Scaffold this active site. Structure first.
Site, PDB file in Angstrom:
ATOM      1  N   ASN A   1     -56.934   2.929  10.438  1.00 23.37           N
ATOM      2  CA  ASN A   1     -57.112   1.803   9.524  1.00 23.37           C
ATOM      3  C   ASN A   1     -56.266   0.605  10.022  1.00 23.37           C
ATOM      4  O   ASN A   1     -56.601   0.027  11.063  1.00 23.37           O
ATOM      5  CB  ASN A   1     -56.857   2.236   8.053  1.00 23.37           C
ATOM      6  CG  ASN A   1     -57.861   3.306   7.568  1.00 23.37           C
ATOM      7  OD1 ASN A   1     -59.073   3.067   7.520  1.00 23.37           O
ATOM      8  ND2 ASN A   1     -57.359   4.490   7.217  1.00 23.37           N
TER       9      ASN A   1
ATOM     10  N   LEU B   1     -48.506   8.387  18.470  1.00 23.33           N
ATOM     11  CA  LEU B   1     -49.295   9.570  18.105  1.00 23.33           C
ATOM     12  C   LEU B   1     -50.735   9.143  17.829  1.00 23.33           C
ATOM     13  O   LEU B   1     -51.671   9.655  18.439  1.00 23.33           O
ATOM     14  CB  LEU B   1     -48.683  10.310  16.905  1.00 23.33           C
ATOM     15  CG  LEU B   1     -47.283  10.940  17.035  1.00 23.33           C
ATOM     16  CD1 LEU B   1     -46.683  11.346  15.698  1.00 23.33           C
ATOM     17  CD2 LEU B   1     -47.322  12.162  17.920  1.00 23.33           C
ATOM     18  N   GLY B   2     -50.918   8.191  16.926  1.00 22.63           N
ATOM     19  CA  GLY B   2     -52.253   7.694  16.662  1.00 22.63           C
ATOM     20  C   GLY B   2     -52.291   6.412  15.862  1.00 22.63           C
ATOM     21  O   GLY B   2     -51.273   5.961  15.345  1.00 22.63           O
TER      22      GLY B   2
ATOM     23  N   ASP C   1     -60.430   8.642   2.030  1.00 23.99           N
ATOM     24  CA  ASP C   1     -60.451   8.654   3.510  1.00 23.99           C
ATOM     25  C   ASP C   1     -60.288  10.075   4.078  1.00 23.99           C
ATOM     26  O   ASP C   1     -59.706  10.279   5.146  1.00 23.99           O
ATOM     27  CB  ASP C   1     -59.349   7.709   4.029  1.00 23.99           C
ATOM     28  CG  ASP C   1     -59.497   7.358   5.507  1.00 23.99           C
ATOM     29  OD1 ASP C   1     -60.613   7.393   6.015  1.00 23.99           O
ATOM     30  OD2 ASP C   1     -58.482   7.069   6.162  1.00 23.99           O
TER      31      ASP C   1
ATOM     32  N   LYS D   1     -44.507   5.667  10.396  1.00 22.33           N
ATOM     33  CA  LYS D   1     -45.727   4.899  10.253  1.00 22.33           C
ATOM     34  C   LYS D   1     -45.352   3.437  10.025  1.00 22.33           C
ATOM     35  O   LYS D   1     -44.463   3.129   9.231  1.00 22.33           O
ATOM     36  CB  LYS D   1     -46.620   5.442   9.124  1.00 22.33           C
ATOM     37  CG  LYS D   1     -47.860   4.587   8.836  1.00 22.33           C
ATOM     38  CD  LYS D   1     -48.852   5.238   7.870  1.00 22.33           C
ATOM     39  CE  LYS D   1     -50.164   4.452   7.800  1.00 22.33           C
ATOM     40  NZ  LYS D   1     -51.080   4.837   6.676  1.00 22.33           N
TER      41      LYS D   1
ATOM     42  N   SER E   1     -50.158   2.560  12.192  1.00 22.58           N
ATOM     43  CA  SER E   1     -49.854   3.207  13.463  1.00 22.58           C
ATOM     44  C   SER E   1     -48.695   4.185  13.223  1.00 22.58           C
ATOM     45  O   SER E   1     -47.760   3.881  12.472  1.00 22.58           O
ATOM     46  CB  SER E   1     -49.495   2.145  14.509  1.00 22.58           C
ATOM     47  OG  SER E   1     -48.746   2.677  15.584  1.00 22.58           O
TER      48      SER E   1
HETATM   49  C1  LIG Z   1     -54.000  11.808  17.265  1.00 19.36           C
HETATM   50  C2  LIG Z   1     -53.188  11.583  16.006  1.00 19.36           C
HETATM   51  C3  LIG Z   1     -52.002  12.306  15.816  1.00 19.36           C
HETATM   52  C4  LIG Z   1     -51.522  11.849  14.588  1.00 19.36           C
HETATM   53  N1  LIG Z   1     -50.404  12.239  13.906  1.00 19.36           N
HETATM   54  C5  LIG Z   1     -49.528  13.213  14.237  1.00 19.36           C
HETATM   55  O1  LIG Z   1     -49.613  13.937  15.221  1.00 19.36           O
HETATM   56  C6  LIG Z   1     -48.391  13.524  13.324  1.00 19.36           C
HETATM   57  C7  LIG Z   1     -47.422  14.514  13.403  1.00 19.36           C
HETATM   58  N2  LIG Z   1     -46.627  14.436  12.309  1.00 19.36           N
HETATM   59  N3  LIG Z   1     -47.191  13.406  11.545  1.00 19.36           N
HETATM   60  C8  LIG Z   1     -46.741  12.989  10.356  1.00 19.36           C
HETATM   61  C9  LIG Z   1     -47.409  11.938   9.727  1.00 19.36           C
HETATM   62  C10 LIG Z   1     -48.529  11.363  10.358  1.00 19.36           C
HETATM   63  N4  LIG Z   1     -48.944  11.827  11.555  1.00 19.36           N
HETATM   64  C11 LIG Z   1     -48.245  12.845  12.114  1.00 19.36           C
HETATM   65  N5  LIG Z   1     -52.372  10.972  14.108  1.00 19.36           N
HETATM   66  C12 LIG Z   1     -52.316  10.320  12.952  1.00 19.36           C
HETATM   67  C13 LIG Z   1     -52.201  11.002  11.747  1.00 19.36           C
HETATM   68  C14 LIG Z   1     -52.164  10.355  10.525  1.00 19.36           C
HETATM   69  C15 LIG Z   1     -52.245   8.973  10.480  1.00 19.36           C
HETATM   70  C16 LIG Z   1     -52.388   8.249  11.656  1.00 19.36           C
HETATM   71 CL1  LIG Z   1     -52.516   6.453  11.573  1.00 19.36          CL
HETATM   72  C17 LIG Z   1     -52.423   8.925  12.876  1.00 19.36           C
HETATM   73  N6  LIG Z   1     -53.437  10.769  14.973  1.00 19.36           N
END
Ligand SMILES: Cc1cc(NC(=O)c2cnn3cccnc23)n(-c2cccc(Cl)c2)n1
Length: 286
Positions: A17, A13-14, A130, A40, A20
């Protein structure tokens, strides 16, 4: 509570810092009826980063709010944090893709929810450190949640600020001045960064209008590395500020500018920001 062997990878997803996040399906019956969850992990495990990650996990476990992503559990072999999957992804991406469909009344509903999630944090003496739209998630059309707590610290009992200087890349273009010059983080520096989040929302994430692009244009793009932070500090001290976004009303810009006060003690509280935003939302319904 979650076993590695039943966690099926679906997609990245992304990154953020030193963490991941992945979309996985947790399927302990192996009949493809398990739920999709967000996982994560550390990009690179060290002893330092693991202890921080453990504290991050304990922080999120301790938080229960409509506008904070839900903790589900942990998975051990290298520690992984299991959270609810929010299907609309990060607010940064969502806003960019649906700009033509998201109006100001809706941005103010998102803004209000962010303030309430942030007030709840201050209630636990947590400093987020952040705040940025990339760190906010969309559950549905009418609800966002603060979605990452990678840099969040607890204030010491006897102080209203927390001093920290991490190695690596700091998001200096969201930082309060006193965070840049002195490494001090507080509820008030979070209020500064909230103002930048509000700026982000009203730009609809137009690339050339990002805080990095606007501050780098104001500083001069010829600047590299160590000189950027120094010129940013001078800019902010001289009351250089991000401009009013295209289409932003004066009263919403004034909220931003009030958040961006060099005087730490004169920035508004998260409870007052919510009230003001909610009052402006109400004046747009009639
Ligand atoms: C482009 C991108 C997409 C996402 N996330 C998610 O779509 C996502 C969906 N449910 N969820 C739960 C928890 C965290 N993230 C999600 N991220 C991200 C968000 C936070 C932290 C980090 Cl390191 C990346 N960046």
């Amino acid at each position: 509570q979650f076993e590695e062997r039943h966690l099926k990878f679906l997609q990245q997803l992304g990154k953020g810092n030193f963490g991941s996040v992945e979309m996985c399906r947790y399927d302990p019956l192996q009949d493809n009826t398990g739920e999709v969850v967000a996982v994560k992990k550390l990009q690179h495990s060290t002893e330092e980063h693991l202890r921080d990650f453990e504290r991050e996990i304990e922080i999120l476990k301790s938080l229960q709010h409509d506008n904070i992503v839900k903790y589900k559990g942990v998975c051990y072999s290298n520690l992984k944090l299991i959270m609810e999957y929010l299907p609309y992804g990060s607010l940064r991406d969502y806003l960019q893709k649906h700009k033509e469909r998201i109006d100001h009344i809706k941005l103010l509903q998102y803004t209000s929810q962010i303030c309430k999630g942030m007030e709840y944090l201050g209630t636990k003496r947590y400093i987020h450190r952040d705040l940025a739209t990339r760190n906010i998630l969309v559950e549905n059309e009418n609800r966002v949640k603060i979605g990452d707590f990678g840099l969040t610290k607890v204030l010491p009992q006897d102080k209203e600020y927390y001093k920290v200087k991490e190695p690596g890349e700091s998001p200096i273009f969201w930082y309060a001045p006193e965070s840049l010059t002195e490494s001090k983080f507080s509820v008030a520096s979070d209020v500064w960064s909230f103002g930048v989040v509000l700026y982000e929302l009203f730009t609809y994430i137009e690339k050339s209008k990002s805080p990095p692009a606007e501050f780098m244009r104001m500083i001069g793009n010829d600047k590299q590395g160590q000189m950027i932070v120094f010129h940013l500090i001078e800019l902010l001290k001289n009351n250089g500020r991000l401009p009013r976004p295209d289409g932003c009303p004066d009263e919403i810009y004034m909220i931003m500018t009030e958040c961006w006060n060099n005087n730490v003690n004169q920035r508004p509280s998260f409870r007052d920001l919510a009230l003001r935003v909610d009052q402006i939302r109400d004046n747009m319904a009639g």
